[PDB]
Amino acid sequence: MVEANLRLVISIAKKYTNRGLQFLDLIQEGNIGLMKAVDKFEYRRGYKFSTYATWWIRQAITRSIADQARTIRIPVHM
């Protein structure tokens, strides 16, 4: 599953590899959200998988950029 959907991970990743942090870190975090979605996904919902891990990936990257990527940590609320 994971080795299959790596291209989803990288595709979504490089929408956000504008000069925020760096490519490969967005990619790696994307693989983390991917592994979550593989751990959680239900076939019985019968939907496509792409959407599910799209959400999960996007969460993971979207707050790893914010936790990291600065010398001064601004937490999520600000």
User: What residues line the site for DNA (CB under 7 A)?
Assistant: 4-8, 10-11, 14, 17, 19, 36, 40-42, 45, 47-52, 54-56, 58-59, 75-78
The C-alpha atoms of residue 23 and residue 16 are separated, in whole angstroms, by 9
Provide, rounded to whole angstroms, the least separation between the CB of residue 71 and DNA: 16
**Nearer CB in complex with DNA: 47/70:** 47
The CA-based dihedral angle spanning residues 44, 46, 48, 54, taken in that order and rounded to the nearest 10 degrees: -50
Burial of 44 (0-12, 13-18, 19+ CB in 10 A): exposed
**Nearer CB in complex with DNA: 14/70:** 14
**Nearer CB in complex with DNA: 6/70:** 6
